[PDB]
Amino acid sequence: MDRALFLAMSGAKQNMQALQLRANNLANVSTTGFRADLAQARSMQAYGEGHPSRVFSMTERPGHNFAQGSVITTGRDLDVTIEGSGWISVLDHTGKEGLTRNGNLKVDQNGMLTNASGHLVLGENDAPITLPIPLSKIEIGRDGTISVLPQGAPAEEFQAVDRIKLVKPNDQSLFKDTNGLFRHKTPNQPYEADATVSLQTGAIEGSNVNAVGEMTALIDLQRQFEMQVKMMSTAEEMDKSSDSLLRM
Amino acid sequence: GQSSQNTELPSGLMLGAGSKVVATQKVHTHGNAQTTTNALDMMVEGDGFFQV
C-alpha cells in the first residue's frame, strides 16, 4: 500500500536468513576442522526516478573465519592437525579435489587412507594414498610423511610410503562448497603442494566458532528484525487511516 | 547451483542444514595390565583377538 511494507518485510526476511547462517555455526561447534561462516548485510539502492529514499539490504557470506581451531589431543597415530595455516587435499565421492582440515584419518580394509567423512586423502603422486594391507605401526611425520612398518618386520625396517598433500593457498581466494570442502573460486586452478605446512600429529583440530560472538550477533538480529516488523504494522495502520478519503 | 559465481554476494549466499554425528569411532589403543592370581585369565599384548 505504501511500499514501505515490503521495504521493511525484506529487511525482516533477510534478518531471518542471517539468523539461519549463525544457527548453523552454533550447531557445528564441536565439528572437526570447521571454519565458521561470516554474515553481513549489503545496502543496495533502488536507482531510478524519484527521491533516493528506498534502499534494500540483503545478507551475504563475505568470508570465513580461517583462524586456528581448538586442538584436541587424542593420542592416536592417525590423528593430525594443521599447524597454523594450511589445508589437506581430498577428493569427495564425485572425484573432485577439495581442501579440508578434518585430520581424523582412518584406514579401510583395502588400505586406502580416508578421513572421518570418507574423503580420500591425496599424496605426492596426486593420487589417493594407499598403504600396504598388513600394517603393524603407522606413524605420520611432521611434514606429512607416512612411514609404516610391515607386519612381522623388525623395528629397523621403517620406510616411508607416501606424503600427505598439504596446500597453503591464499585464504581469501577460497570458498566453501556445498559439501563443506573449500575450493578455488577460479575453476581449473591447480592446488600446489606446499612444503611449509606442518602437521601436529597426535591431535585433532576442532571448530573455530566463537560461541559468544554468535550469541551477541543473535541478539542484534532479533532487535533489528522486530523493529522492521513494527514498520510493517505502522504501514498498514497508515493505509487504514487514509482509506477515509473516499468514504462519504 | 552456481555456487562459485558470486559466492561473496547476496546471490551466492549458501546456508547450512545443521550438524550430525557421522560415526562413533572405536579407538583400539592398548590398555594397561592387571596382574591377577587366576591361572585361566589371559591377555594379548599387542595386535590380536581371542576367538570364541
Binding site: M44, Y47, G48, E49, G50, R54, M58 | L9
Partner: peptide, 19 residues
C-alpha cells in the same frame, strides 16, 4: 508531472558496475 514517455523501471543491483 504527466509525461508522454513511460517511466523506466528502478534497478536494485548487487554491484553498480554490473548494471
Amino acid at each position: 508531472a504527466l509525461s508522454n514517455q513511460p517511466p523506466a523501471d528502478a534497478s536494485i543491483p548487487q554491484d553498480v558496475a554490473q548494471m
